[PDB]
RNA sequence: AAUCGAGAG
DNA sequence: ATACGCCTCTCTGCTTATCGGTAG
DNA sequence: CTACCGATAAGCAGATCTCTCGATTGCGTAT
């Protein structure tokens, strides 16, 4: 048995509040800089299709 | 522009061409002693304990010297202002003998993976 | 790198048997199985821990920062 | 001299001009400056047929001696398995597997009946 | 199939479908053999598909004559294979192919400046007509009795340098068409699907199949193309063929999509009376 | 994953029928006489024409594939489940192939009975310009194994040639999934 | 992972007493689901486990 | 050496001042010798510097590059020499420019490196780098090509064409593409600078050597004088040339026309006559692999290429697949270094000439003999050739003024990561087709073909984007790095029956064409050609005849209906791919290449050696696989995608990088604490010494559905084993 | 059967020329034979030059022979006559050039 | 911040 | 040393040139 | 007859899921 190098301490990230982007006042990119994750186009489309509108907002 | 180191042949030997004699063009490799060339087949001759192939094979012209022994005139005997094409041409080439495969020795049936020896009961119930 | 103190599966202390295994292999012309049986390793879980140890620490040790070479 | 539709000079080998493009009764070698009469060159003929792969036709396919056409009836796709048909229940139901969506995702099989023609592409 | 087809239907709404096809129901009394005869009579046949070989015999000795002797397949072969007659073939040769050939020859020249003839006087009038109507022809004779060959001399002038006169003939022979319904290149009679007899032709031209009422149920003529259906059948038929097409892709992959979804997609696409698409 | 002695006997007896399927398929695709020898010069000439022409190559690779797949189906039906030494419900491999928990009868047949013909796109394995499908096979080989018919099974391992053909097929699968990942969608974005 | 492309993340560290024990007293250090094999078809892992047990014996 | 051959063939670039038909004074600068040394430090008297120091200082490991110019004036009146250092040239470890060149394992361990260190990589800025091995078209072989882009190039262009890659002894590459035009004319294409050029093929034929037109007719058309296709095509070509260029009635006029046409791009000297500059372009472009003073050979080669193109367009020969290993070879990585060094020194000469020309155009205090002037002008250009090379290593960007025949600019050097020794050894065996093919949509280039049996590993290939592109080498596949001594093979072939080329007057695929390194030797029948190939292989295997090295590649191509173009082709050059095989007669090891393999029967094991079908056999089937693809146990029982994923994930484990980790400063290093040797392993596990770098641990694995926490892919680890150090790493 | 050899003539007696296909020459052409077994030939006329030479690469291995074979006997008159390649130049436009450099 | 390389799903 | 000035292989549509058909 | 149009042929503009790491980012003149 071989132990691969993709340990889980390099994968998890959590953000409640923190640093924000310069001109958009939105969360920064990157796990190591304390940034938020992206709710993209497909996430937006799926959040509309639920009829979940307060959730999407 | 005469090349350096090249000497013109001021005299040349003759060329006795007049069933009349045919003219043949024959090739030899450097590995043939043309000096003591005892004979040639028409075919797998042996020369100096070595075998050669002989077979048959016109662009190439014949340059026979004229009655001056200072240059060459183009050969012609039928009076057609055309070179007298060789009546027969032969070629000599090296040959080698390739060993036949000994299938009796090279067709080896597959040997099964050899069973280990000295194998005994290495596992016994607890308390034994 | 160096011999593990205990067998991974059961926990039988195999850390005190590497030198003895080497001696039984070198001095006597014992097979690995015979040497391990004479070493007191019966379960193949314990047998593998000494049969397959590589001992890379000896190679590691030849690079000593604190001794002139 | 003249070969088929071409004439070459006998003395230097340069390509002579086509006779019917120059003056009468004499043509000139450009290199040797020699003279060649426009006689002895009565015709410059070249007979050429087609590529024999030029015209791909159904008759050209049937012109051959090998088998060229595969009928729909004569093709038995094979790969018979004993899966259960969800439409009728005939035992035969052809198959084919095509890994999808990853180098690790599960396989899917294109189950196809032979009686009712029903299709079923079910992963599991 | 698949994403390319869905791009055509939904993302492009191309009028020029990559592979247009027509579905032509047959009357239940027309036999299968008669259906294949109808297929042969409808399908396009080029002049190339009936010529075995063409022998071009140039002779520059000051007119550069260019005798051409095009060999045909045996009549009993090619008539039975393509429903083509000797007279129709002769008309095609005498009318279309020679004019095309001479057009190609003059284009090449313009770029380049930078078995027996025992006539029956009918062939002689034909040859005189061809000679008059054509810019280079000087000889012409057709195997009227056997329909196996055709030879004609295309005489030229020594001003012009060498021509291939074989690649030219090959290209023109591929170009020229013996008979053709516009936009149709082939009518193939597949095996029935769901017990209904159908002919499928490789191009969509609705107004041309309406002639053969005796063979085709024109009430059932539906085709692959949506733009053509929208042109000749209106918006609603276009919506129906949109739904059937976008359902045919998923069925062949055995993927079930509720017809409500496809219906909503089709109604959004044809909401302006036209064949819109999901693009900018 | 094992069979019985008589199960393996059935398997080997049916596979011994696959010594002539490829040759007969070739002999009929070249419109030749049946029972024609595999070294016939006329057969080799017609096979060379088939190799040169892509459409005729497709015809050969369809007919031969049909016959060898028939042989494979015979083997699978005859040797499963009547050949396994351990049977359902005891046989866990067969159990989870039957129950749909994981796997399929195709996988079970591949492990226990036959790997069968490998098909690259719709045709068999590629043929080199010399008429050789592999260095090991002579030019214009009318053998099923030469054309990619893997008669081995994952229980008893596959020969080097069949291993190479199987690698061709696996690489084809990974290339297909590479194409799918590269060009996947934007249809959904344009619709939505 | 094993040497047969049988990767998989460590789900839980099972306690030794909760692990199944054999008649010889050994508890495996790795538990692999039997359902990994029918689709992957890595019979090499089966024959390797066989040979590794025999060699360790 | 390659560098000295390159500086030789570079030539001299001259400048004038015009100072009193006196064109001015002549200054022809050139470099005639380039020397390198193992790196030293001034820490007075130089002390040897070992790569451990470079690694530990997070700096580079580069020596001294010595350049001696030749400041020659007016055809050798006075010669000035100056040995100028040009910055630090990085060198690869375990090479003769490294201090570890022959150190035993004991010495290597003493000097802090490793027990069984392998070099092959560079150290730049404290980061290890390596030069990947690109795979390119086979050198010096004209292969018929059918390509749609050829016709897309313009009107009257067709798909057909012949492309040849010729290589100089410097190992630089020149492409000569023979397009075909539907009217009848053939257009020789080449590319000197980044721009391309088109030349009628008869013009270049006549610029080569004094020839008639009947000789061209006979050299392109053999005794096949009844083939109307050929006669008409060649008549169109000859008459078109005789029309468009009627005044060019001799070789000198043709050459002067070429020299007139090519003046500014070739940077021709104002001294050089048009005739001699035309000869310069002819010898610097056309079939460079024959070199200068080989005009008759180039003429025969071009006639061969033209007749082959007409054979292709008549459908009498099949196209040659450009992405099959049968027609390929690999750029070694040191040869890329040599070519880029030649380019950099060429730019260096151009820079010093630009400086002296700036001195001309700003002032006049200039004198070629003035050594003060020479020192002042040399010390005002940028002589950081070595720093340019370090940039090339550390970026992978090929900053070239011209660009070699490489179709890509970037992606040449990649880091050699030390996660794991499987990864490290895998860097040195991977072949990339190129980034051009990385960004493409044609799947067929990504296939696996029966032409890579034993050369490319069928298994070792990453999935994802680089699938089928980045494919590794079979562990017994060797790449030749030396030219075989072919000086005597022409002498042997003539004895065998290869009738000499110069006076045979034959051509066409109806006879065999015997060629060596892209240089026609003679012409012979097909039966006799097969016999000659057999005899060559036999005499090469029994190493008695001193004319036939073992690396000789006897590619015989029999007459096949619409197949590959026939002929007997011999090779001996660099960059070939070679692999051992057992020649059945005499039962001894033979060496075969991808070109010749696809026409010979090589039994996979001795049990199925058929009668009169086989002449070779593998030593073992296992040598067709890579090291990673051979270390997988019982891999013939697995499904192939699973083997491929193992090849990928063996390079991703946390094993041991090495043992000298106390003397390295790598950015990130994963190390396994306690490894073990496998109980069940391949034989080649020991041969490659993998036990020095254990990768995994033996574990007791239960195939059991017991937990419920491992269903899809997860697995359960015993907690007690984890507390006992099972699978621990730092 | 086999054919006997009378006498191999190592001294230059005959030469062989290969100009091109279908070559014919005037009755007043003669060629200058030089030796160094390599030869360099030269023949001139009013409008042409028969500039030729041997190929040293081919000659060092292969050697040709011209022989007269008696029908009424079993003997061959062998001779050592090498073959020279010949490029026929023309006096008409051999020395026709252009200006050295265009301004 | 752009690219380049390496990878995870 | 240091501040000014600068450099080879896709695929839909929408929009325009160009040398001739086309009703009154 | 004459605008007046127009079926070609030709030119031109835009796309082609999320995530984590590292390495590197340019050069000629003139006071
Ligand atoms: Zn234990
Ligand atoms: Zn002449
Ligand atoms: Zn059914």
Swiss-Prot record, chain B:
Query: What are the alphabetically sorted keywords of the record?
Result: DNA-directed RNA polymerase, Nucleus, Phosphoprotein, Ribosome biogenesis, Transcription
Can you provide one Gene Ontology molecular function annotated for this UniProt record? DNA-directed RNA polymerase activity
User: Subcellular localization, per the record?
Assistant: Nucleus, Nucleolus
Phosphoserine is found on 30
Give the principal location in a single coarse category: nucleus
Q: Name one GO cellular component term.
A: nucleolus
Q: List the disulfide bonds.
A: none
Q: Could you state one GO biological process linked to this protein? A: transcription initiation at RNA polymerase I promoter
Name the job this protein performs: DNA-dependent RNA polymerases catalyze the transcription of DNA into RNA using the four ribonucleoside triphosphates as substrates. Component of RNA polymerase I (Pol I) which synthesizes ribosomal RNA precursors. Besides, RNA polymerase I has intrinsic RNA cleavage activity. The heterodimer formed by RPA34 and RPA49 stimulates transcript elongation by Pol I.
So what family is this one in? Answer: Belongs to the eukaryotic RPA34 RNA polymerase subunit family.
Question: What further fact does the record state?
Answer: Present with 3360 molecules/cell in log phase SD medium.
Outline the subunit composition. Component of the RNA polymerase I (Pol I) complex consisting of 14 subunits: RPA135, RPA190, RPC40, RPA14, RPB5, RPO26, RPA43, RPB8, RPA12, RPB10, RPC19, RPC10, RPA49 and RPA34. The complex is composed of a horseshoe-shaped core containing ten subunits (RPA135, RPA190, RPB5, RPO26, RPB8, RPB10, RPC10, RPA12, RPC19 and RPC40) where RPA135 and RPA190 form the DNA-binding cleft. Outside of the core, RPA14 and RPA43 form the stalk that mediates interactions with transcription initiation factors and newly synthesized RNA.
UniProt lists the gene as RPA34
Query: Which residues of the whole protein does the chain here span?
Result: 24 to 175 of 233
From Swiss-Prot, chain C:
> Per the UniProt entry, what are the Gene Ontology biological process annotations, in alphabetical order?
nucleolar large rRNA transcription by RNA polymerase I; ribosome biogenesis; RNA-templated transcription; termination of RNA polymerase I transcription; termination of RNA polymerase III transcription; transcription by RNA polymerase I; transcription by RNA polymerase II; transcription by RNA polymerase III
Q: Which Pfam families match?
A: RNA_pol_N
Which residues are Zn(2+)-binding?
Answer: 7, 10, 45-46
> Cellular component terms, GO, for this chain's entry?
nucleoplasm; nucleus; RNA polymerase I complex; RNA polymerase II, core complex; RNA polymerase III complex
Show the cross-link location (Glycyl lysine isopeptide (Lys-Gly) (interchain with G-Cter in ubiquitin)): 59
Q: Which UniProt keywords apply?
A: DNA-directed RNA polymerase, Isopeptide bond, Metal-binding, Nucleus, Ribosome biogenesis, Transcription, Ubl conjugation, Zinc
What is a GO molecular function of this protein? DNA binding
- The question of whether Transferase is a record keyword is answered with no
Q: Localized where?
A: Nucleus, Nucleolus
User: So which domain of life are we looking at?
Assistant: Eukaryota
- Explain the purpose of this protein: DNA-dependent RNA polymerases catalyze the transcription of DNA into RNA using the four ribonucleoside triphosphates as substrates. Common component of RNA polymerases I, II and III which synthesize ribosomal RNA precursors, mRNA precursors and many functional non-coding RNAs, and a small RNAs, such as 5S rRNA and tRNAs, respectively. Pol II is the central component of the basal RNA polymerase II transcription machinery. Pols are composed of mobile elements that move relative to each other. In Pol II, RBP10 is part of the core element with the central large cleft.
Q: What else is known?
A: Present with 5300 molecules/cell in log phase SD medium.
From Swiss-Prot, chain E:
Where in or outside the cell is it found?
Nucleus, Nucleolus
Top-rank taxon: Eukaryota
Q: What does this protein do?
A: DNA-dependent RNA polymerases catalyze the transcription of DNA into RNA using the four ribonucleoside triphosphates as substrates. Component of RNA polymerase I (Pol I) which synthesizes ribosomal RNA precursors. Besides, RNA polymerase I has intrinsic RNA cleavage activity. RPA190 and RPA135 both contribute to the polymerase catalytic activity and together form the Pol I active center. In addition, subunit RPA12 contributes a catalytic zinc ribbon that is required for RNA cleavage by Pol I.
What is stated as this protein's family in its record? Belongs to the RNA polymerase beta' chain family.
Q: What else is known?
A: Present with 2840 molecules/cell in log phase SD medium.
What does the record note on quaternary structure? Component of the RNA polymerase I (Pol I) complex consisting of 14 subunits: RPA135, RPA190, RPC40, RPA14, RPB5, RPO26, RPA43, RPB8, RPA12, RPB10, RPC19, RPC10, RPA49 and RPA34. The complex is composed of a horseshoe-shaped core containing ten subunits (RPA135, RPA190, RPB5, RPO26, RPB8, RPB10, RPC10, RPA12, RPC19 and RPC40) where RPA135 and RPA190 form the DNA-binding cleft. Outside of the core, RPA14 and RPA43 form the stalk that mediates interactions with transcription initiation factors and newly synthesized RNA.
Q: From the Swiss-Prot or TrEMBL record, give the protein name.
A: DNA-directed RNA polymerase I subunit RPA190
Source organism (scientific name): Saccharomyces cerevisiae (strain ATCC 204508 / S288c)
UniProtKB/Swiss-Prot annotation, chain G:
Q: Superkingdom of this entry's organism?
A: Eukaryota
Q: Which residues cross the membrane?
A: none
Q: Where in the cell is it found?
A: Nucleus, Nucleolus
Subunit and partners: Component of the RNA polymerase I (Pol I) complex consisting of 14 subunits: RPA135, RPA190, RPC40, RPA14, RPB5, RPO26, RPA43, RPB8, RPA12, RPB10, RPC19, RPC10, RPA49 and RPA34. The complex is composed of a horseshoe-shaped core containing ten subunits (RPA135, RPA190, RPB5, RPO26, RPB8, RPB10, RPC10, RPA12, RPC19 and RPC40) where RPA135 and RPA190 form the DNA-binding cleft. Outside of the core, RPA14 and RPA43 form the stalk that mediates interactions with transcription initiation factors and newly synthesized RNA.
Q: Which family does it belong to?
A: Belongs to the RNA polymerase beta chain family.
Q: What else is known?
A: Three distinct zinc-containing RNA polymerases are found in eukaryotic nuclei: polymerase I for the ribosomal RNA precursor, polymerase II for the mRNA precursor, and polymerase III for 5S and tRNA genes.
Protein name (Swiss-Prot/TrEMBL)? DNA-directed RNA polymerase I subunit RPA135
Query: Which source organism does the UniProt entry give?
Result: Saccharomyces cerevisiae (strain ATCC 204508 / S288c)
Question: Parent protein range shown?
Answer: 918 to 974 of 1203
């Amino acid at each position: 048995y071989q132990r691969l190098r993709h340990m889980v301490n390099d994968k998890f990230q959590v953000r409640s509040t923190g640093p924000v982007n310069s001109l958009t006042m939105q969360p920064v990119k990157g796990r190591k800089r304390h940034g938020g994750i992206r709710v993209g186009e497909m996430e937006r489309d799926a959040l509309i299709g639920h009829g979940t509108s307060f959730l999407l907002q | 522009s005469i090349p350096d180191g090249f000497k013109k042949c001021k005299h040349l030997k003759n060329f006795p061409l007049n069933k009349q004699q045919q003219v043949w063009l024959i090739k030899f490799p450097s590995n043939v002693d043309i000096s003591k060339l005892k004979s040639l087949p028409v075919t797998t001759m042996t020369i100096d304990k070595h075998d050669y192939k002989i077979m048959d094979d016109s662009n190439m012209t014949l340059l026979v010297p004229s009655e001056s022994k200072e240059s060459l005139k183009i050969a012609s005997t039928a009076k057609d202002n055309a070179p007298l094409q060789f009546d027969k041409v032969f070629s000599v080439s090296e040959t080698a003998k390739i060993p036949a495969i000994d299938y009796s020795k090279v067709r080896v049936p597959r040997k099964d993976v050899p069973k280990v020896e000295g194998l005994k009961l290495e596992h016994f119930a607890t308390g034994y | 790198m160096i011999v593990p103190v205990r067998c991974f599966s059961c926990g039988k202390v195999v850390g005190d048997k590497w030198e003895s295994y080497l001696n039984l292999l070198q001095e006597d012309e014992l097979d690995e199985g015979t040497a391990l049986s004479r070493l007191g390793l019966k379960r193949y879980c314990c047998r593998r821990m000494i049969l397959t140890h590589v001992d890379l620490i000896e190679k590691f040790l030849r690079y000593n920062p604190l001794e002139k070479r | 001299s003249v070969v088929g539709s071409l004439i070459f000079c006998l003395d230097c080998g340069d390509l002579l001009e086509n006779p019917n493009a120059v003056l009468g009764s004499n043509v000139e070698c450009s290199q040797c400056k020699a003279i060649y009469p426009k006689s002895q060159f009565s015709n410059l003929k070249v007979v050429t047929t087609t590529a024999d792969d030029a015209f791909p036709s159904s008759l050209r396919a049937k012109k051959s001696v090998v088998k060229t056409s595969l009928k729909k009836n004569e093709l038995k796709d094979g790969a018979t398995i004993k899966e259960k048909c969800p439409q009728c229940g005939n035992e035969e139901m052809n198959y084919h597997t095509l890994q999808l969506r990853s180098a690790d995702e599960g396989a899917t099989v294109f189950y196809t009946c032979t009686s009712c023609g029903y299709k079923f592409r079910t992963n599991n | 199939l698949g994403i390319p087809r869905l791009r055509e239907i939904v993302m492009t709404a191309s009028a020029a479908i990559k592979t247009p096809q027509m579905t032509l129901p047959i009357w239940n009394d027309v036999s299968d053999e008669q259906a294949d005869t109808f297929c042969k009579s409808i399908s396009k046949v080029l002049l190339s598909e009936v010529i075995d070989k063409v022998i071009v015999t140039e002779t520059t000795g000051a007119a550069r004559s260019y005798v051409i002797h095009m060999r045909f397949f045996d009549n009993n072969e090619y008539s039975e294979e393509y429903d083509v007659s000797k007279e129709e073939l002769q008309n095609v040769i005498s009318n279309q192919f020679i004019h095309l050939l001479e057009a190609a020859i003059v284009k090449e020249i313009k770029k380049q400046k930078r078995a027996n003839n025992n006539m029956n006087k009918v062939q002689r009038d034909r040859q005189s007509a061809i000679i008059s109507h054509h810019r280079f022809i000087t000889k012409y004779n057709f195997d009227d009795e056997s329909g196996k060959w055709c030879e004609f001399k295309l005489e030229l002038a020594a001003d012009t340098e060498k021509l291939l006169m074989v690649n030219i003939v090959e290209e023109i022979c591929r170009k020229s068409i013996i008979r053709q319904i516009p936009h149709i290149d082939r009518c193939v009679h597949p095996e029935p699907e769901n017990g209904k007899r159908v002919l499928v032709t490789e191009g969509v031209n609705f107004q041309a199949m309406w002639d053969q009422e005796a063979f085709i149920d024109v009430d059932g003529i539906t085709s692959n193309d949506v733009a053509a259906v929208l042109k000749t059948y209106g918006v609603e038929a276009a919506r129906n063929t949109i739904v059937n097409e976008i359902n045919n892709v998923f069925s062949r992959y055995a993927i079930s999509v509720s017809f409500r979804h496809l219906d909503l997609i089709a109604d959004m696409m044809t909401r302006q009376g036209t064949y819109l698409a999901f693009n900018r | 994953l094992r069979l019985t002695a008589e199960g393996n006997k059935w398997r080997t007896d049916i596979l011994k029928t696959s010594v002539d399927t490829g040759r007969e398929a070739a002999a009929e695709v070249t419109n030749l006489d049946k029972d024609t020898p595999a070294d016939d010069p006329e057969l080799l000439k017609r096979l060379q024409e088939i190799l040169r022409d892509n459409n005729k190559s497709g015809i050969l690779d369809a007919v031969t594939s049909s016959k060898v797949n028939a042989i494979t189906s015979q083997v699978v039906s005859k040797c499963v489940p009547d050949g396994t030494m351990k049977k359902f419900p005891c046989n866990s491999m067969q159990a989870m192939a039957l129950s749909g928990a994981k796997g399929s009868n195709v996988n079970v047949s591949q492990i226990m009975c036959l790997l069968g013909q490998q098909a690259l796109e719709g045709r068999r394995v590629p043929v080199m310009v010399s008429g050789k499908t592999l260095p090991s096979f002579k030019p214009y080989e009318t053998d099923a194994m030469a054309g990619g018919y893997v008669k081995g099974r994952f229980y008893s391992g596959i020969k080097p040639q069949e291993y190479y053909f199987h690698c061709m097929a696996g690489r084809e699968g990974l290339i297909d999934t590479a194409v799918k990942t590269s060009r996947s969608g934007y249809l959904q974005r344009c619709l939505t | 992972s094993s040497r047969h492309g049988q990767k998989g993340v460590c789900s839980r560290k099972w306690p030794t007493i909760d692990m199944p024990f054999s008649e010889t007293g050994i508890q495996p250090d790795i538990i692999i689901n039997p359902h990994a094999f029918p689709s992957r078809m890595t019979i090499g892992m089966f024959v390797e486990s066989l040979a590794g047990k025999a060699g360790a014996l | 050496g390659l560098l000295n051959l390159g500086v030789k063939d570079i030539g001299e670039k001259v400048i004038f001042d015009g100072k009193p038909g006196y064109l001015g004074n002549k200054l022809s600068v050139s470099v005639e010798q380039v020397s390198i040394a193992k790196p030293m430090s001034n820490d007075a008297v130089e002390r040897k510097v070992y790569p451990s120091e470079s690694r530990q200082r997070l700096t580079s490991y580069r020596g001294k590059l010595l350049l001696k110019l030749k400041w020659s004036v007016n055809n050798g009146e006075e010669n000035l020499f100056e040995v100028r250092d040009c910055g630090g040239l990085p060198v690869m470890l375990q090479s003769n420019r490294c201090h570890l060149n022959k150190m035993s394992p004991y010495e290597l361990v003493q000097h802090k490196e490793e027990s069984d260190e392998i070099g092959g990589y560079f150290i730049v800025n404290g980061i290890e780098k390596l030069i990947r091995m690109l795979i390119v078209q086979r050198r010096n072989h004209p292969m018929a090509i059918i390509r749609p882009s050829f016709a897309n190039r313009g009107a009257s262009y067709s798909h057909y064409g012949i492309q040849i890659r010729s290589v100089r002894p410097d190992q630089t590459s020149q492409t000569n593409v023979l397009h075909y035009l539907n009217d009848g004319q053939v257009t020789f294409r080449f590319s000197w600078r980044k721009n391309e050029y088109l030349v009628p093929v008869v013009m270049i034929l006549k610029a080569l050597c004094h020839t008639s037109d009947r000789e061209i007719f006979d050299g392109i058309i053999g005794n096949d004088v009844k083939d109307s296709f050929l006669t008409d095509r060649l008549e169109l070509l000859l008459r078109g040339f005789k029309k468009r260029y009627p005044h060019l009635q001799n070789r000198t006029q043709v050459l002067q026309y070429l020299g007139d046409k090519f003046r500014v791009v070739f940077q021709a000297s104002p001294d050089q006559s048009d005739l001699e500059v035309g000869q310069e372009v002819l010898d610097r472009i056309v079939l460079v692999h024959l070199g200068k003073d080989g005009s008759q050979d180039k003429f025969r080669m071009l006639l061969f290429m033209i007749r082959k193109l007409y054979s292709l367009v008549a459908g009498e020969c099949s196209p040659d697949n450009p992405d099959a290993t049968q027609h390929q070879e690999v750029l070694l990585g040191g040869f890329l270094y040599g070519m880029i060094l030649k380019e950099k020194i060429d730019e260096y000469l151009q820079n010093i000439i630009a400086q002296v020309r700036m001195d001309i155009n700003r002032g006049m205090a200039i004198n070629f003999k003035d050594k003060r002037y020479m020192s002042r002008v040399l010390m005002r250009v940028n002589e950081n050739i070595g720093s340019k090379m370090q940039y090339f290593l550390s970026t992978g960007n090929l900053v070239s003024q011209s660009g070699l025949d490489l179709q890509q600019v970037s992606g040449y050097t990649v880091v050699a990561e030390k996660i794991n020794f499987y990864r490290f050894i895998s860097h040195f065996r991977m072949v990339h087709r190129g980034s051009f093919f990385a960004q493409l949509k044609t799947t067929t280039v990504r296939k696996l073909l029966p032409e890579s049996w034993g050369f490319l590993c069928p298994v070792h290939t990453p999935d994802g984007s680089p699938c089928g592109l980045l494919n590794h080498f079979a562990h017994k596949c060797r790449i030749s790095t030396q030219q075989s001594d072919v000086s005597r093979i022409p002498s042997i072939l003539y004895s065998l029956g290869v009738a000499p080329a110069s006076h045979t007057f034959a051509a066409g695929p109806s006879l065999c064409c015997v060629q060596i390194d892209g240089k026609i030797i003679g012409w012979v029948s097909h039966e006799q050609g097969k016999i000659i190939a057999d005899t060559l292989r036999y005499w090469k295997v029994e190493g008695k005849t001193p004319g036939l090295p073992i690396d000789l590649e006897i590619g015989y191509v029999p007459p096949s209906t619409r197949g590959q173009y026939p002929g007997l082709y011999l090779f001996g050059g660099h960059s070939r791919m070679l692999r051992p095989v057992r020649y059945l007669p005499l039962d001894k090891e033979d060496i075969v290449g991808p070109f010749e393999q696809v026409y010979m029967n090589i039994a996979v094991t001795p049990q199925e050696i058929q009668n009169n079908v086989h002449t070779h056999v593998e030593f073992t089937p296992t040598n067709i696989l890579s090291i990673l693809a051979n270390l997988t146990p019982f891999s013939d029982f697995n499904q192939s995608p699973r083997n491929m994923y193992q090849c990928q994930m063996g390079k991703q484990t946390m094993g041991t990088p090495g043992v000298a980790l106390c003397h390295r400063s790598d950015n990130k290093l994963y190390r396994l604490q306690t490894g073990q040797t496998p109980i069940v392993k391949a034989n080649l596990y020991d041969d490659y010494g993998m036990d020095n770098f254990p990768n995994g641990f033996n574990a007791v694995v239960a195939v059991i559905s017991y937990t419920g926490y491992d269903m899809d892919d997860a697995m359960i680890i015993n907690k007690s084993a984890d507390e006992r150090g099972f699978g621990y790493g730092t | 059967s086999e054919i006997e050899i009378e006498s191999v003539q190592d001294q230059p007696s005959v030469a062989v020329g290969s100009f091109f296909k279908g070559f014919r020459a005037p009755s007043d052409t003669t060629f200058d034979l030089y030796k160094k077994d390599e030869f360099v030939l030269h023949g001139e006329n009013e409008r042409l030059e028969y500039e030729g030479y041997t190929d040293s690469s081919s000659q060092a291995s292969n050697q040709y022979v011209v022989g007269l074979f008696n029908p009424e006997k079993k003997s061959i008159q062998l001779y050592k006559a090498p073959v020279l390649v010949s490029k026929v130049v023309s006096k008409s436009s051999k020395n026709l050039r252009g200006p050295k450099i265009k301004s």
